[PDB]
Design an enzyme around this catalytic site. Structure first.
Site, mmCIF file in Angstrom:
data_model
loop_
_atom_site.group_PDB
_atom_site.id
_atom_site.type_symbol
_atom_site.label_atom_id
_atom_site.label_comp_id
_atom_site.label_asym_id
_atom_site.label_seq_id
_atom_site.Cartn_x
_atom_site.Cartn_y
_atom_site.Cartn_z
ATOM 1 N N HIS A 129 0.776 -1.210 -0.078
ATOM 2 C CA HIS A 129 -0.104 -0.071 0.125
ATOM 3 C C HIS A 129 0.902 1.490 -0.069
ATOM 4 O O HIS A 129 0.307 2.318 -0.097
ATOM 5 C CB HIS A 129 -1.115 0.094 1.178
ATOM 6 C CG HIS A 129 -0.556 0.047 2.628
ATOM 7 N ND1 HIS A 129 -0.639 -0.816 3.362
ATOM 8 C CD2 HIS A 129 -0.243 1.216 2.899
ATOM 9 C CE1 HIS A 129 -0.344 -0.457 4.583
ATOM 10 N NE2 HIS A 129 0.054 0.992 4.538
ATOM 11 N N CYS A 165 3.866 1.468 9.306
ATOM 12 C CA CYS A 165 3.651 0.139 8.347
ATOM 13 C C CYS A 165 5.390 -0.215 7.860
ATOM 14 O O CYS A 165 5.899 0.556 7.843
ATOM 15 C CB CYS A 165 2.746 0.342 7.130
ATOM 16 S SG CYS A 165 0.993 0.293 7.806
ATOM 17 N N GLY A 180 2.677 5.856 9.593
ATOM 18 C CA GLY A 180 3.871 5.858 9.249
ATOM 19 C C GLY A 180 4.660 4.483 9.668
ATOM 20 O O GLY A 180 5.804 4.118 9.533
HETATM 21 C C1 4WI Z 1 0.335 1.853 8.182
HETATM 22 N N1 4WI Z 1 1.613 2.842 8.127
HETATM 23 C C2 4WI Z 1 -0.799 2.454 8.641
HETATM 24 C C3 4WI Z 1 -0.739 1.787 10.189
HETATM 25 C C4 4WI Z 1 -1.999 2.211 10.833
HETATM 26 C C5 4WI Z 1 -2.356 3.768 11.066
HETATM 27 C C6 4WI Z 1 -2.990 3.954 12.089
HETATM 28 N N2 4WI Z 1 -2.685 2.551 13.133
HETATM 29 C C7 4WI Z 1 -2.089 1.650 12.287
HETATM 30 O O1 4WI Z 1 -1.578 0.857 12.851
HETATM 31 N N3 4WI Z 1 -1.813 1.466 8.103
HETATM 32 C C8 4WI Z 1 -2.965 1.669 7.483
HETATM 33 O O2 4WI Z 1 -3.204 2.943 7.635
HETATM 34 C C9 4WI Z 1 -3.772 0.916 6.824
HETATM 35 C C10 4WI Z 1 -3.686 0.946 5.318
HETATM 36 C C11 4WI Z 1 -4.968 1.409 4.903
HETATM 37 C C12 4WI Z 1 -5.978 1.809 5.885
HETATM 38 N N4 4WI Z 1 -5.175 1.247 7.030
HETATM 39 C C13 4WI Z 1 -5.632 1.217 8.566
HETATM 40 O O3 4WI Z 1 -4.946 0.546 9.227
HETATM 41 C C14 4WI Z 1 -7.014 1.618 8.690
HETATM 42 N N5 4WI Z 1 -7.753 0.350 9.258
HETATM 43 C C15 4WI Z 1 -8.657 -0.362 8.350
HETATM 44 O O4 4WI Z 1 -9.073 0.014 7.271
HETATM 45 C C16 4WI Z 1 -9.118 -1.744 8.784
HETATM 46 F F1 4WI Z 1 -9.945 -1.582 9.929
HETATM 47 F F2 4WI Z 1 -9.674 -2.553 8.236
HETATM 48 F F3 4WI Z 1 -8.274 -2.441 9.396
HETATM 49 C C17 4WI Z 1 -7.310 2.854 9.559
HETATM 50 C C18 4WI Z 1 -8.710 3.044 9.552
HETATM 51 C C19 4WI Z 1 -6.347 3.784 8.856
HETATM 52 C C20 4WI Z 1 -6.833 2.222 10.997
HETATM 53 C C21 4WI Z 1 -4.499 0.379 4.454
HETATM 54 C C22 4WI Z 1 -4.043 0.027 2.961
HETATM 55 C C23 4WI Z 1 -5.161 -0.914 4.857
#
Ligand code: 4WI
Ligand code: 4WI
EC number: 3.4.19.12
Lengths: 302, 303
Positions: free
Chosen positions: A41, A145, A143
């Protein structure tokens, strides 16, 4: 003596963390040999993440669309490929700090250390247990990830997790280093349910042995139980059924203390039915299931 | 989101850990520039530790009696001196991995990461909080002495603790890097009592702010108390009095959540007077005082 939740020394993993930017999205990457591994992503804009077609998004990218930074030095990407939910960026330089490593897929109940990173820079290290529902209770911000989970067996780093997302319940989800998610999750910003969690029975028993080794003995007695009868109490309290394989794994701790596994099961069965009645085991008022028998042996014998 | 007890990345400190052997006693040392720092009781046999005369015991040791090893490399000892409860061994090589560093003395309520080591090899990392009675609740086995505690501020490693002993209560005690013990302890195998402890009020409040930042709000209430009224409650439940300096240190968290310190103090007053009633906060059934306001701010931003 003492019993503390403990992470592996992070040095070997710190030398592999890089920053990966694709357009406006920046996350972390893991640089091993001449390959940088990161969540796919990274190729998404904010809107893309709602319903991404990763194959189409990757077609639009070329090697020069990926900015990889190792500290203050840019690494040139010379190839790119998608494997499941992970991007593999071939770089023109092999990581001189690559430790001896392997990629492993862990099972529920197992633990690993997470080296939380932001912009390719390490910020902290903590331990996680992979829950029965394939989620972890971590600490991940925007950030984060591309931060990885690992275990170290002497000089070999076994990478088992790469961080991708946070679920509506506040729990965290990710993949192995081949990009396969743990659990039924997808890398799309859409509401997703995690299954019901169950307590990791073998881990609670391991922690009760750690408590005994440290001087706690009030929960101990001459009562015992069959594996079948403990499992009936376990089902009532949402604990995983105990198998002979799990009993066997607890053998070293059982031999060290002189308390048979089914004898500790009778103690656990009593703690669930009667409660603790105002006491604390190893500084906790609750039964803990985040420590494996190996995590206990690691601090209570060696 | 998610709040976790977290250690600093340990790589910089791992590069400084060496094995120190004197006769039959082996423990860990910290190698910075051309000096190895280690607990002075490395010179003791098991019998000596009951009532050691360190000055006389050290007079009978020569540089050859100390074997220092970095990995599989022998570092030749060319000088030795004792500073308080620390032994300083001058070696023939400067550590090429010496990070930028300071030696600091921390206060009760402050936290640090401990890199637990055995035979000069790091085995694990965890956070510790210095209690009001100058003890820490660690995990240390035989041969863990010489393991250090530290904080990292971007590139500088501030070493604050060196491990020396375990008290009859199961708690741990040690020195700063100048060899001065935290607390009233002496490095002799004799029963020693740690003071009565007091809960670190400002840390409990910082952890309640961490809880709100992570969606745990059940304990929030519509009341706002005063500093004087909160302090009447604190002295009854064995909590440190809250000072204006502590309220000031909580400022950034109060601003980030929009919850005034005295609004949060009314939540703490109710948690103390009514009890937690079996409820949990950040997965815990107890009020936690192991996190400073700086630890909560650093973690909730991602420094
Ligand atoms: C990567 N850097 C982030 C880490 C997230 C940010 C907040 N806490 C974390 O661990 N990953 C993301 O933002 C991923 C990314 C899109 C959306 N996302 C999510 O983790 C979202 N969660 C979901 O949509 C769910 F519930 F399905 F897991 C969010 C709402 C931002 C917490 C993708 C591509 C999955
Ligand atoms: C150094 N490697 C050990 C670390 C100890 C071993 C068990 N857990 C630890 O933290 N330090 C010692 O063995 C020191 C050392 C002599 C005795 N000692 C103790 O920690 C003993 N404690 C005390 O005598 C007390 F209560 F005063 F702290 C022991 C009974 C072995 C736990 C010296 C020189 C203090």
């Amino acid at each position: 003596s003492g019993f503390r939740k403990m992470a592996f020394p992070s040095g070997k993993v710190e030398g592999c963390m890089v920053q990966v930017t694709c357009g406006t999205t920046t996350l972390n990457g893991l640089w091993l040999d001449d390959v940088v591994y990161c969540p796919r992503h990274v190729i998404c804009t904010s809107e893309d993440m709602l319903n991404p077609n990763y194959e189409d998004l990757l077609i639009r990218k070329s090697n020069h669309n990926f900015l990889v930074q190792a500290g203050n030095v840019q690494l040139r990407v010379i190839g790119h490929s998608m494997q499941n939910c992970v991007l593999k960026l071939k770089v023109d330089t092999a990581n001189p700090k690559t430790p001896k490593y392997k990629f492993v897929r862990i099972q529920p109940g197992q633990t690993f250390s997470v080296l939380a990173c932001y912009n390719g820079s390490p910020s902290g290290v903590y331990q996680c247990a992979m829950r029965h529902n394939f989620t972890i209770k971590g600490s991940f911000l925007n950030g984060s990830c591309g931060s990885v989970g690992f275990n170290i067996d002497y000089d070999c780093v076994s990478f088992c997790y790469m961080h991708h997302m946070e679920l509506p319940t506040g729990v965290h989800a990710g993949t192995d280093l081949e990009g396969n998610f743990y659990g039924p999750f997808v890398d799309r910003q859409t509401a997703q349910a995690a299954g019901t969690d169950t307590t990791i029975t073998v881990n609670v028993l391991a922690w009760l042995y750690a408590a005994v080794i440290n001087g706690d003995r009030w929960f101990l007695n001459r009562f015992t139980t069959t594996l079948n009868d403990f499992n009936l109490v376990a089902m009532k309290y949402n604990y995983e059924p105990l198998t002979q394989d799990h009993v066997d794994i607890l053998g070293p701790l059982s031999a060290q203390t002189g308390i048979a596994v089914l004898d500790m099961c009778a103690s656990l069965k009593e703690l669930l039915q009667n409660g603790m009645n105002g006491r604390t085991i190893l500084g906790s008022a609750l039964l803990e299931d985040e420590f494996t028998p190996f995590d206990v042996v690691r601090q209570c014998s060696g």
